C-alpha cells in the first residue's frame, strides 16, 4: 500500500494498545548421510574390472 507519514517537529505518535502474536520459522539442520562402495558401484562385482 501507500502511506504518508506527516513529519512535523511539534508532534510525536505513540500507540495505546499492544498485542502479542506468534509466527513460525523453519530451518534445515542436516541432510541424509550416505556412503559409497567403490567396486560395487563402478564395476558391479566383476573381478577383472576390479
Amino acid at each position: 500500500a501507500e502511506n504518508s507519514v506527516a513529519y512535523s517537529n511539534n508532534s510525536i505518535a505513540i500507540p495505546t494498545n499492544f498485542t502479542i502474536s506468534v509466527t513460525t520459522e523453519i530451518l534445515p539442520v542436516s541432510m541424509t548421510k550416505t556412503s559409497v562402495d567403490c567396486t560395487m558401484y563402478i564395476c558391479g562385482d566383476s573381478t577383472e574390472c576390479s
Binding site: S35, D37, T39, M40, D45, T47
Partner: peptide
C-alpha cells in the same frame, strides 16, 4: 588404509559380497 598401524576408530573396509562359484547358461527347452 595402507598402513601397518591403525589408529582407534571405525573404518569401512570391504563388502559381504560373494564372488561367483561357476558359470550358468540356460536356454529354452
Amino acid at each position: 588404509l595402507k598402513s601397518f598401524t591403525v589408529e582407534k576408530g571405525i573404518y569401512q573396509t570391504s563388502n559381504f559380497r560373494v564372488q561367483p562359484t561357476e558359470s550358468i547358461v540356460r536356454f529354452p527347452n
